[PDB]
């Protein structure tokens, strides 16, 4: 999902771009208890089949001089052990689940405890998963207002 989000990456000039084929986790260099003793991550190397095109310059937009492909490594990702723990530095750590605001749109009202009036002020948040929030609210004098972030 993340690689199809980001890749393919174009260039600014647009004479070439880097695309993605597949990924494959390497075999861990140590297993769980040896990583536990030594004091190091229980980690898998990530080996990705990246693919770079080359277009032709004088030829118009979309032509191919050449294209190359290889398995290239990026980053050690820790693997979860057989139970649910991550061995990160010889200390077994657990990533506890979070319980957060589901992105969407949420209507709400501060129940009449503002503006010294007893008038309720409905508001609406557009909560993105990743991006800038959006707020609408009523003035006490019935004016619709917006604010970003």
């Amino acid at each position: 999902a993340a690689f199809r989000s980001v890749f393919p990456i174009q260039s600014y000039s647009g004479n070439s771009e880097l695309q993605y084929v597949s990924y494959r986790l390497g075999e861990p260099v140590f297993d769980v208890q040896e990583c536990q003793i030594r004091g190091v991550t229980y980690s898998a190397p990530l080996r990705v089949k990246l693919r770079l095109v080359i277009y032709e310059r004088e030829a118009p937009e979309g032509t191919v001089k050449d294209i190359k492909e290889q398995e290239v490594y990026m980053g050690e990702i820790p693997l979860m052990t057989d139970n649910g723990t991550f061995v990160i530095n010889g200390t077994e750590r657990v990533i506890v689940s979070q319980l957060h605001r589901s992105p969407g749109v949420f209507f709400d009202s501060d129940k009449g405890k503002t503006h010294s009036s007893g008038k309720v002020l409905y508001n609406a948040r557009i909560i993105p998963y990743r991006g800038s929030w959006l707020d609408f609210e009523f003035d006490p004098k019935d004016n619709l207002f917006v604010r970003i972030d």
Partner: protein, 49 residues
């Protein structure tokens, strides 16, 4: 490697295993924390949440 190692190594919800039982670890892997990034905090939480 930095953006993985920081989160798995030292994050706000990457916590140390309570491992003085079987029960303690199995109730720690099932924990539902409302804290963290994108969530509330311990001293700024009302009576209602």
């Amino acid at each position: 490697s930095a953006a993985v190692k920081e989160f798995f190594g030292s994050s706000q919800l990457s916590q140390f295993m309570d491992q003085n039982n079987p029960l303690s670890e199995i109730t720690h892997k099932r924990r539902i924390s409302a804290l963290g990034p994108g969530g509330l905090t311990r001293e700024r939480a009302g009576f209602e949440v």
